[PDB]
């Protein structure tokens, strides 16, 4: 592994809207990473005649 050709790595807690502490390495130096949406909370992972009847019936 070449020392000076790639950026840094650090164990960061990835946060979603569900409230999950995700202790895994990342490159962001915030210490704890917060995201609004992820797979745990995403929705994907989780006639004119009628209008006449509404208007007049």
């Amino acid at each position: 592994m070449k020392t000076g050709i790639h950026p840094e790595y650090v164990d960061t807690t990835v946060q979603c809207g569900c409230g999950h502490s995700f202790t895994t390495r990342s490159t962001k130096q915030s210490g704890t990473i917060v995201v609004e949406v992820c797979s745990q909370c995403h929705p994907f992972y989780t006639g004119r005649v009628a209008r006449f009847e509404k208007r007049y019936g």
Binding site: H6, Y9, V14, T24, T27, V37, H42
Partner: protein, 181 residues
């Protein structure tokens, strides 16, 4: 320690595929081989700085320094000449592959605006899937205030599978947000 996607594939995805297709020998189980992210600038033929911006974007998102692809043919409609940088490329294998796959599937894809799923029809014979993004803002490894111009990708996932059906089965078991056809 083992990446969670790799651990999951080792434990339950393998047995799922074995039950689904009933392979004669243990080493017919289709697995991921490598991931290649291609970012062809094209417009870099005028200014080199576009290739450098692409280099930084790829290095940030994947995590390793990307390789510049030379133009192997001269063309006049695109005023192309042999040898100038045209696009970058990264080959991801092993642990870095698995990490990147986890990041993309669980973070990047849901961050896509009005995301409706990726068509499961993009395989080609051997079940090597390849889709393409239009920008790089879905990844938070980059900074929106830092970026200035969109740069799409071509992520291709080459697998050990022999057929398109096996490849789509493996990708769906992995957690790919396919559409339904």
């Amino acid at each position: 320690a083992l990446p969670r996607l790799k651990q999951r594939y080792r434990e339950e995805i393998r047995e799922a595929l074995q039950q689904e297709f009933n392979y004669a020998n243990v080493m017919q189980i289709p697995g991921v081989v490598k991931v290649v992210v291609n970012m062809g600038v094209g417009d870099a033929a005028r200014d080199a700085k576009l290739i450098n911006g692409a280099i930084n974007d790829l290095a940030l998102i994947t995590g390793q320094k990307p390789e510049v692809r030379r133009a192997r043919k001269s063309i006049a409609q695109f005023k192309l000449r042999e040898g100038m940088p045209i696009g970058a490329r990264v080959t991801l294998r092993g642990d870095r592959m698995w990490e990147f796959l986890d990041r993309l599937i669980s973070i990047a894809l849901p961050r896509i605006r009005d995301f409706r799923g990726l068509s499961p029809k993009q395989f080609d014979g051997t079940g090597n899937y390849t889709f393409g993004l239009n920008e790089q803002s879905m990844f938070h490894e980059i900074d929106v205030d830092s970026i200035d111009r969109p740069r799409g990708m071509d992520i291709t996932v080459v697998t050990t599978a022999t057929n398109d059906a096996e490849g789509r089965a493996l990708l769906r078991a992995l957690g790919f947000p396919f559409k339904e056809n």
